[PDB]
Design a protein around this ligand. Structure first.
Ligand SMILES: [Ca+2]
Length: 223
């Protein structure tokens, strides 16, 4: 997250870190057994880390649970990132508590203009590289479809939305991929892509989770 703030330990209790020997992507706990992330964060051998604040110190509220299954969307296209969503099943259910909690899936899609909370352990520099240890947060508004398509001509599908600041300076970034965009208390986006991070006229692009709720529900009903 570039231009964000330190969230505060366990104040984003549905945020997970995906670990394959190191943190590589975020995700969102949607019930005790399932995490939603980005399909471009697929790796074999994922361990889900819940209750994290500092990802490099065991502070006492973590649960580390191996994934048993990952399910990339059936229509994921890794070239365009259309349908950039994946489900990860935990080998064992998380113990839900004040620091490890699920986020609701949406009933309706979020509105342009809505300020959402984006979080993660990704890079905090627009130019250069610095990865935080503790979870960072950003409030960013959803941008109109026409603004998003003007920023990325011929690249935005109906399964993507933009959020952020066209003047630059505030955005998600590498290493935040897969993590949540929460708007009015529901998971509305997944950190997916953008041109650089926090560059002028190049806002973040997010997977539109409200288009996937039927797939998520039927998949979790089946696995
Ligand atoms: Ca930790």
């Amino acid at each position: 997250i570039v231009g964000g703030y330190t969230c505060g330990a366990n104040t984003v209790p549905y945020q997970v870190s995906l670990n394959s020997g190191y943190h590589f992507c975020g995700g969102s706990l949607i019930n005790s057994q399932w995490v939603v992330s980005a399909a471009h964060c697929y790796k074999s051998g994922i361990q889900v880390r819940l209750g994290e604040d500092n990802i490099n110190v065991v502070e006492g509220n973590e649960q580390f649970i191996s994934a048993s299954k990952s399910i990339v969307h059936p229509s994921y296209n890794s070239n365009t990132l259309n349908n950039d969503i994946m489900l990860i099943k935990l080998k064992s259910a998380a113990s839900l508590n004040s620091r490890v909690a699920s986020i609701s899936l949406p009933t309706s899609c979020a509105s342009a203009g809505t300020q959402c909370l984006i979080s993660g352990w990704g890079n905090t520099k627009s130019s250069g590289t610095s990865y935080p240890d503790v979870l960072k947060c950003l409030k960013a508004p959803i941008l109109s479809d026409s603004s998003c398509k003007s920023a990325y001509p011929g690249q935005i599908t109906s399964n993507m939305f933009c959020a952020g600041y066209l003047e630059g300076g505030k955005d998600s970034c590498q290493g935040d991929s897969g993590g949540p965009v929460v708007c009015s208390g529901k998971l509305q986006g997944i950190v997916s892509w953008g041109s650089g991070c926090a560059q002028k006229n190049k806002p973040g692009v997010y997977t539109k989770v409200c288009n996937y709720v039927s797939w998520i529900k039927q998949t979790i009903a089946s696995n």
